[PDB]
Amino acid sequence: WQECMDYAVTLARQAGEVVCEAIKNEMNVMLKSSPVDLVTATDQKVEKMLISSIKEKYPSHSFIGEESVAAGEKSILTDNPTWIIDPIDGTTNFVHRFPFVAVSIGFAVNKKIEFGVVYSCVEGKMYTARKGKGAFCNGQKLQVSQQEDITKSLLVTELGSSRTPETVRMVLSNMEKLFCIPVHGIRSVGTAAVNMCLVATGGADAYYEMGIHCWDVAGAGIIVTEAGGVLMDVTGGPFDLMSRRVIAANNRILAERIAKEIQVIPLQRDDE
Amino acid sequence: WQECMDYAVTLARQAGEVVCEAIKNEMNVMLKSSPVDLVTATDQKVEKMLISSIKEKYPSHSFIGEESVAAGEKSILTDNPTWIIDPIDGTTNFVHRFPFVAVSIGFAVNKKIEFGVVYSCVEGKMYTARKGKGAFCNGQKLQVSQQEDITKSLLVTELGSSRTPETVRMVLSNMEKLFCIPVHGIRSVGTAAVNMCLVATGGADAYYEMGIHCWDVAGAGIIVTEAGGVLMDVTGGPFDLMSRRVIAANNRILAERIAKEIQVIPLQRDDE
Numbered sequence: 238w239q240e241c242m243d244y245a246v247t248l249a250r251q252a253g254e255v256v257c258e259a260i261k262n263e264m265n266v267m268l269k270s271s272p273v274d275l276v277t278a279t280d281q282k283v284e285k286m287l288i289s290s291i292k293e294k295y296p297s298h299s300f301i302g303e304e305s306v307a308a309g310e311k312s313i314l315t316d317n318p319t320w321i322i323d324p325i326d327g328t329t330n331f332v333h334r335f336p337f338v339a340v341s342i343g344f345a346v347n348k349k350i351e352f353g354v355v356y357s358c359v360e361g362k363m364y365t366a367r368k369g370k371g372a373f374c375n376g377q378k379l380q381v382s383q384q385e386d387i388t389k390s391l392l393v394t395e396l397g398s399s400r401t402p403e404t405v406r407m408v409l410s411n412m413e414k415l416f417c418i419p420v421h422g423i424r425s426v427g428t429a430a431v432n433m434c435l436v437a438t439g440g441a442d443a444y445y446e447m448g449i450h451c452w453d454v455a456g457a458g459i460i461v462t463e464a465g466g467v468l469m470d471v472t473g474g475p476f477d478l479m480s481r482r483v484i485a486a487n488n489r490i491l492a493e494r495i496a497k498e499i500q501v502i503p504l505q506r507d508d509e
Numbered sequence: 510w511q512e513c514m515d516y517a518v519t520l521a522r523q524a525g526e527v528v529c530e531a532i533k534n535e536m537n538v539m540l541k542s543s544p545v546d547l548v549t550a551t552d553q554k555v556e557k558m559l560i561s562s563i564k565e566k567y568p569s570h571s572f573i574g575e576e577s578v579a580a581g582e583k584s585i586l587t588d589n590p591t592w593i594i595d596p597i598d599g600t601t602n603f604v605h606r607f608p609f610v611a612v613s614i615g616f617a618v619n620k621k622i623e624f625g626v627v628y629s630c631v632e633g634k635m636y637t638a639r640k641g642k643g644a645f646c647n648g649q650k651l652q653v654s655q656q657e658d659i660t661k662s663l664l665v666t667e668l669g670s671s672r673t674p675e676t677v678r679m680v681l682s683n684m685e686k687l688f689c690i691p692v693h694g695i696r697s698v699g700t701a702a703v704n705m706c707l708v709a710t711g712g713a714d715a716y717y718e719m720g721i722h723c724w725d726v727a728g729a730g731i732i733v734t735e736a737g738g739v740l741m742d743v744t745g746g747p748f749d750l751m752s753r754r755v756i757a758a759n760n761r762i763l764a765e766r767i768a769k770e771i772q773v774i775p776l777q778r779d780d781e
């Protein structure tokens with residue numbers, strides 16, 4: 238898989254320069270399923286670029302890409318080597334030129350993530366990890382923080398893509414409960430992958446979110462774990478890449494505490 | 510004032526260097542008015558260095574510094590040339606090694622901000638503005654976004670330092686109201702000064718917060734305005750530096766819509 242990985246880094250770095258030059262130009266913003274569900278020609282271009290290049294080199298491999306799913310493709314994960322991608326994690330940020338945008342690539346075999354590559358383009362920060370081999374950022378080794386007291390923690394989360402009153406109310410109510418424990422604070426950068434990378438560096442103690450997709454988390458998941466973190470479902474069960482829910486934390490104490498305080502939202506699985 | 514400004518820039522870089530070394534070291538974390546109201550020895554030494562360096566060149570100027578006020582110095586703003594400083598804007602970020610921390614220096618004459626310097630030390634971005642001269646980041650001129658439609662905007666805000674349930678509930682309901690217009694999103698990097706510089710670069714369309722202090726916004730206020738944006742009170746009225754409230758937007762159209770949607774939170778003024 239090292240070869241695939243080596244290749245993935247080169248691809249991500251390259252896709253990153255396309256995003257990077259694009260962010261300075263005018264964009265034709267399109268809508269997908271709602272007025273806040275955005276896409277640009279750059280997300281589509283980037284995904285097409287990634288997919289042709291990998292299939293050209295790994296014809297037998299499968300793909301799960303955000304925009305191809307939007308175009309008809311189905312997000313079912315088999316045992317087969319699969320490339321899980323969000324051409325631009327932080328699409329909204331991209332549209333606004335908010336400087337937190339990543340190319341996210343996760344590689345799964347036997348339905349378990351083997352490596353991950355997350356390229357925060359505007360900062361020129363390359364985050365990578367290979368199962369059993371470490372988490373790095375521009376060659377520097379990552380380690381999650383040591384914090385076991387929630388009352389001294391810094392959390393990351395996002396507001397979500399739903400604008401339905403009932404759902405928003407649940408998301409804010411979950412926030413409120415955490416906030417009031419109290420915790421040191423809550424931050425929101427606008428990208429699950431970047432948020433999770435902040436946990437892998439020890440900058441944030443934990444990230445949680447409900448409503449994400451497998452492409453948003455496939456790359457960064459392994460980076461948190463290889464940095465010494467844990468992935469868990471918000472239900473307190475085992476992390477499930479297709480569940481639309483995640484808790485990425487420095488340790489299991491913090492993760493179970495968060496699971497405890499928040500209420501789950503009903504969501505349609507990515508494999509349904 | 511150019512001279513003063515030229516000297517402020519130098520001091521910012523110097524203090525910026527102290528913060529950056531310290532961030533990777535073990536810290537002495539102390540409490541101020543509560544368990545979530547933090548201070549480190551770095552906050553204190555940077556502020557001391559700044560003031561003692563200023564007083565030396567300009568013995569007759571006045572100072573409003575966060576940690577000094579904390580120490581008994583009052584926060585009364587007079588016509589005298591006054592330096593308004595947050596030695597570390599984003600103290601909580603600093604304690605966690607969350608990479609958004611800034612040195613913020615505002616300089617006011619006749620109760621009006623004449624120039625501001627915000628150094629985001631970790632990113633290495635020097636933001637400066639001088640009334641009537643423009644706003645820059647590392648030598649590149651800034652300009653706010655042109656978005657006039659609230660439904661296509663990206664907002665930045667903070668949850669605040671209060672953990673009083675009534676208050677918390679007001680912050681979140683304010684958020685809910687904006688969220689549901691809907692707006693494209695809401696971000697939080699953990700520092701008023703950096704959040705405001707993101708508006709000045711056109712990365713975010715507007716920033717609002719109730720509960721900041723004059724030292725949190727004095728430096729960044731002039732950056733947004735010289736970038737072509739506006740400062741307004743939450744009433745839709747004129748910006749009042751000592752009021753603990755601000756709307757910093759690309760333009761008056763978005764500024765006024767936000768003012769129209771949010772409810773005021775009662776707070777003690779900096780001058781009370």
Ligand SMILES: [Gd]
Nearest residue numbers: 323325326328
């Ligand atoms: Gd995306």
Ligand SMILES: [Gd]
Nearest residue numbers: 595597598600
């Ligand atoms: Gd501070």
